Amino acid sequence: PLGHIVANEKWRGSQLAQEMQGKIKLIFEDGLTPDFYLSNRCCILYVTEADLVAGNGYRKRLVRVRNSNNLKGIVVVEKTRMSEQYFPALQKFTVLDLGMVLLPVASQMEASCLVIQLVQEQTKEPSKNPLLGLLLSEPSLLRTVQQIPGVGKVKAPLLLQKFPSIQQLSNASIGELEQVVGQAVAQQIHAFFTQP
Amino acid sequence: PLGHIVANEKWRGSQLAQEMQGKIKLIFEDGLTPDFYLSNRCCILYVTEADLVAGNGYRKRLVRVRNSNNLKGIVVVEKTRMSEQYFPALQKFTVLDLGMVLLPVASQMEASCLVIQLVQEQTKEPSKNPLLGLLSEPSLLRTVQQIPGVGKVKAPLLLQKFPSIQQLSNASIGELEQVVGQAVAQQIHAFFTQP
Amino acid sequence: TCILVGGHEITSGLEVISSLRAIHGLQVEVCPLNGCDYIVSNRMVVERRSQSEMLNSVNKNKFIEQIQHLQSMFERICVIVEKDRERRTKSYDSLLTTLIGAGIRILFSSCQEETADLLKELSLVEQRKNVGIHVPSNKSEALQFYLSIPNISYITALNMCHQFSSVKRMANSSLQEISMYAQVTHQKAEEIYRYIHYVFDIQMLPND
Amino acid sequence: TCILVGGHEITSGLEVISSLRAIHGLQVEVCPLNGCDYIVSNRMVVERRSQSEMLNSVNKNKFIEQIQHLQSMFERICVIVEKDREFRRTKSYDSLLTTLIGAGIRILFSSCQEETADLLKELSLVEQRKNVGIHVPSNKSEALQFYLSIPNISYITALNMCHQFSSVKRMANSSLQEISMYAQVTHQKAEEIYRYIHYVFDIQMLPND
DNA sequence: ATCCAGCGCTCG
DNA sequence: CGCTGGATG
DNA sequence: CATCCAGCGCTCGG
DNA sequence: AGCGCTG
Ligand SMILES: [Mg+2]
Ligand SMILES: [Mg+2]
Ligand SMILES: [Mg+2]
Ligand SMILES: [Mg+2]
């Protein structure tokens, strides 16, 4: 749905549902295993303090979502002082076993402001995400060739004029080198490329 | 002796003795266990390539010198390509067991120019050796600025009222509150008493 | 299992480093890495950031550029958001959602010991994808040369130094050899191969 | 047996560091030390210098100032002159060596990083036998930075303070003798620390501004 | 067999 | 600030 | 009672 | 130099 969130009935009038009002619209619905749906293919699995204290009851649902095709789960988990001891074990499971995204929250209040952002990010085009959306090598090659002992600022360009690639430079005889840089620096270059 | 080196006979006309000519004077002498004497109390024990290849025959003499009172030995050793493998074992012995100074040389030529310096250093007064010869206020400002809550401005106010680190450390929250806010007082108090 | 740590981590990560050695039994080497915290495998780098660093919006664009640098050299990037030693913003949530949308994995840690634990777990996964670091003085000039190659990581340069008997042997290698010996992707071996075969032209530079 | 290595040593000492761990079985920690290479004990620091660094007369005065700084915090200073990786002597080089000898700075010579690590280990053993070795294993981070701010004390001295005093207040109320024993410093050095913590600050000793 | 000039290198 | 190669003896 | 700046500590990057 | 917190 557009500009909307499909929600599980159980969040009717919760602090989460309350703080999202006006910011974002909630279509409630029954029989849903996941807590929310941001789009058709991205859902949320809210794990509460109660869920995490009890044991590994939360996991059943997480397994279903990951093993569903046509669907991805974002797990949001209540990381309090009470629960923090159980969080490592959950995160290992959620992130490293199942491969799913996990976001801790102190409270439902925080999960409100977080879920608004996830929805703003989904709606955003992938280009305007800076971690989704060619050069002259000449400058780099000067610096690479300057790592050869004997070769500085002045000898680097002279060598790349006669031997125009690193490969050709690497294959150059002492004789060919002597013409450009003289006997000593020729030996240094030759030694560098061939020392086993 | 003055401006001089007492030397063992065996160095008569060696490359070492030759390169010291003009620079420094050599009084030769027989029956000496050590190779040279710079002063009456500082001597040299030259260990040659031959000495180091053979085994641990060199050590006997080193032990004598260390165990002499009224005498200190500088061991100079010929570190060539040949000898380099044996040098670790010597250095362990000379420097770490016996506590004596060890100086490697490639050749006698180098030992010439080295021994001239040792003699120039001995003759020098210990003051002109730079490795022989403040208000705390600025530091204390910086120390007190390591206390969380306390920066440039609060540091001097605290040291005006609690003029030493000790007194600052013993200040009550009440005494702190007069100088800084209730919050920064708690930070300071917490810092000094947190076990 | 080997892991490389940036030298800068000794100013804030001493318990991470020492746990990794002691508790986890990894070979841990502190290295002069330029622009990354933990190299966990040939494919995976891990950035470690305190909550405060993530909250501080002054750090947002700098972090994003750091992740962009790391994207050119590594296929898998993980951020570990570590709780500060002894309050949440839109820009913090915004950064997290940005990272999610670019498939940058996020992990949360309450202390340096737990960071070390995550680093170890991440180490294990990568070992099972046969992209782990395999390493053990006359090859020092060669390393600095390989590090000069654009958009390659320290471990890629190290692999080159370890695997090619000589620099010439490296520069005459095939794309496939570079892929295997330097332990890089096809795309990445292609970038290295093009670089080494690139025909320098002095007239592409300015004069004075 | 523990040894602290300056972080800067990873730019030239990687085989020293890893030998120490692997071959010699020391606990080796790479630390943000300010102005020294190897802290080998509470009393002993080791400076590592290549032949080239020692030959280069541009480095002479700077080296001597380095040794002078180290003299205010350490009783035993060793220089290891390590051969450059794959040497003509100068007067200035010989002059430096003779200077160091005359001030009882111990000198050792090494042909490679492996041999440097071996000397560092031997030096570690001697010091262990003088019961001045480093004894260490951290929500005491503020406290460390405070102790490091104390003038003319080394990183290990500040670490000892952090480890041994339950609180900063306990440190600042300690006797000279306690500081000596807990911080593992000499009488003279404990005296300098005690005077510092009891020093009566006077704002009028600073400029007005 | 010798001054120096240009360069690479190190360092601040 | 040392080293190399080259112009000047 | 709920705010609004202003001064400060802190971090960061020149 | 810009940013968050305290009276
Ligand atoms: Mg799925
Ligand atoms: Mg070069
Ligand atoms: Mg004696
Ligand atoms: Mg402060």
Residue numbers in the entry:
A (entry chain B): 15 to 147, 152 to 214
B (entry chain D): 15 to 147, 153 to 214
C (entry chain A): 1818 to 1903, 1913 to 1962, 1967 to 2038
D (entry chain C): 1818 to 1903, 1912 to 1962, 1967 to 2038
From the reporting publication:
FANCM is crucial in genome maintenance, functioning in the Fanconi anemia (FA) pathway, alternative lengthening of telomeres (ALT), and replication fork protection. FANCM recognizes branched DNA structures and promotes their remodeling through ATP-dependent branch migration. Here we present crystal structures of FANCM’s N-terminal ATP-dependent translocase domain (2.2 Å) and C-terminal FAAP24-bound region (2.4 Å), both complexed with branched DNA. The N-terminal translocase domain specifically recognizes DNA junctions through multiple key elements, while the C-terminal FAAP24-binding domain engages adjacent double-stranded DNA.
